[PDB]
């Protein structure tokens, strides 16, 4: 059923959202002050900047395919309308 | 201790672009959903 | 691509539509008058009544699954709206 | 020659039910599409 | 008697022929109209 | 050292846990809001 497929794309999207969210908040705090910045190294930030950019890329992909999916809902909804309502 | 006051600025800029990136995609998606209600 | 799947369900539907259409018009003409009815037998009509009921059943199935498909467009369109517009 | 004037009526009735059947399904589908534009 | 290869060929050919959704839809719309 | 069967079990268990679309959506909506 499409409800099993939908739930999946939705679920993956929600994980990259949570993923990115945590990371960003994490990195915000580390750069919030020099006091908190001293408990980290310039090689940790370098690590985080990667982890974060990787999520961004995956998240941006999920938003993109969500866009394509909505494009498909419209096309098919439009087609049905021409068949049954015109 | 810490990092350059400008290295901070660079990262903050990068993160902002990432944000603008994702928001643009969300924007587009919203136009799609709104245009569905209009068509 | 969903455009290859869509085109298919749409295409089958169009064939059962044309199928049913031809048959019905065909049977209409045979029962249009006794003059045309004399060129056919009560065993031909019996044949047609079957051919026609078989299409009806298949057509009714296609309309049904089209309904379920539209139900899915709505659910997913509604979900996306809650995620992005609320 | 031909068939009963009422056997004709029976068939004509059957065909009508088939028609009403298909139209009901089309009806439902149309409500779905219309309700989409409303939601 | 009957050439198998040809009917096959005729099948293959029609399958490879393609559907213009626009056209498809217009046929369905007129089909539904011509009946219901 | 590390129990393989358990991590496996933990995997299996979470996968079998199910998503309440309603709930899912609400999390996403708050996630998007908390950022963009």
Q: At C86, which CATH number?
A: 6.10.140.1350
Under a CB-based contact definition with an 8 Å cutoff, are residues D12 and B12 in contact? no
Could you give the angle at which helices A42-84 and E21-33 cross, rounded to 10 degrees? 40
Q: Return d(Cα A44, Cα B11) in angstroms, integer.
A: 13
* A26: CB partners within 8 A, 6+ apart: A48
What value does the CA radius of gyration of chain A take, rounded to a whole number of Å?
A: 20
Task: Retrieve residue B30's tokens.
Answer: 């919203």
CB contact A20 to F (< 8 Å)? yes
* A42: CB partners within 8 A, 6+ apart: B3
Q: Return d(Cα E30, Cα E27) in angstroms, integer.
A: 5
DSSP-derived letter for residue C40 is S
First to last CA, chain A: 30
* C62: CB partners within 8 A, 6+ apart: C9, C12, C13, C16
Task: Retrieve residue A8's tokens.
Answer: 């999946």
Which residues in chain A touch residue B21, judged by CB atoms under 8 angstroms apart? 56, 60
CB pairs under 8 A, 24+ apart, for C77-81? C77/A70, C77/A73, C77/A77, C77/B33, C77/B36, C77/D36, C77/D39, C78/D39, C79/A6, C79/A10, C79/F21, C79/F25, C80/A66, C80/A70, C80/A73, C80/B29, C80/B33, C81/B33
User: How close B2 comes to chain C (CA, Å)?
Assistant: 38
Q: Return d(Cα D5, Cα D8) in angstroms, integer.
A: 5
> What is the CA angle B20-A43-B18, rounded to 5?
5
Phi-psi region of A59 (alpha: psi -120 to 50; beta: other; left: phi over 0): alpha
Under a CB-based contact definition with an 8 Å cutoff, are residues A86 and A33 in contact? no
Which one, of C71, C55, C43, lies nearest residue C15 by Cα?
A: C55
Could you give the angle at which helices F21-33 and A2-32 cross, rounded to 10 degrees? 30
* C27: CB partners within 8 A, 6+ apart: C45, C48, C49, C52, D15
Under a CB-based contact definition with an 8 Å cutoff, are residues A48 and B11 in contact? no
CA C12 vs CA E27, F20, F25: distances in Å: 13, 35, 35
User: How close A51 comes to chain B (CA, Å)?
Assistant: 12
CA F23 vs CA A18, B10, D18: distances in Å: 14, 37, 43
Task: Retrieve residue A25's tokens.
Answer: 């908040």
* E36: CB partners within 8 A, 6+ apart: D19, D22, D23, D26
Cβ contact E19–C11 (<8 Å): yes
CB contact C66 to E (< 8 Å)? no
DSSP-derived letter for residue F11 is H
**Which residue bears the tokens 């810490």?**
B2
DSSP-derived letter for residue F17 is S
- Resolution reached, in Å? 2.5
Q: Return d(Cα C26, Cα C47) in angstroms, integer.
A: 12
Q: Return d(Cα F11, Cα F17) in angstroms, integer.
A: 10
Q: Mutate one of C78, C80, C83 to test the F interface: name it (highest F CB count within 10 A).
A: C83
By CB neighbour count within 10 A (0-12 exposed, 13-18 middle, 19+ buried), where does A16 fall? Answer: buried
- Full domain range(s) for residue A48: 1-86
Name the 3-class secondary structure at F20: coil
Under a CB-based contact definition with an 8 Å cutoff, are residues C14 and E31 in contact? yes
From the list C52, C56, C67, the residue facing D29 with the nearest CB is: C67
The domain total for chain C is 1
CA C4 vs CA A73, C1, C65, E17, E21: distances in Å: 14, 6, 17, 14, 11
Name the 3-class secondary structure at B29: helix
Q: Return d(Cα F30, Cα A48) in angstroms, integer.
A: 23
* B8: CB partners within 8 A, 6+ apart: A31
Q: Return d(Cα A81, Cα B4) in angstroms, integer.
A: 59
């Amino acid at each position: 059923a499409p409800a099993d497929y939908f739930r999946v794309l939705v679920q993956q999207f929600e994980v990259q959202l949570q993923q990115y969210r945590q990371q960003i908040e994490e990195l915000e705090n580390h750069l919030a002050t020099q006091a908190n910045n001293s408990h980290i190294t310039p090689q940790d930030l370098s690590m985080a900047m990667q982890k974060i950019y990787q999520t961004f890329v995956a998240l941006a992909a999920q938003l993109q395919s969500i866009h394509e999916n909505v494009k498909v809902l419209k096309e098919q909804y439009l087609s049905y309308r021409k068949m049954f309502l015109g | 201790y810490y990092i350059d006051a400008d290295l901070l600025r660079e990262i903050k800029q990068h993160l902002k672009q990432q944000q603008e990136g994702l928001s643009h995609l969300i924007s587009i998606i919203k136009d799609d959903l709104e245009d569905i209600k209009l068509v």
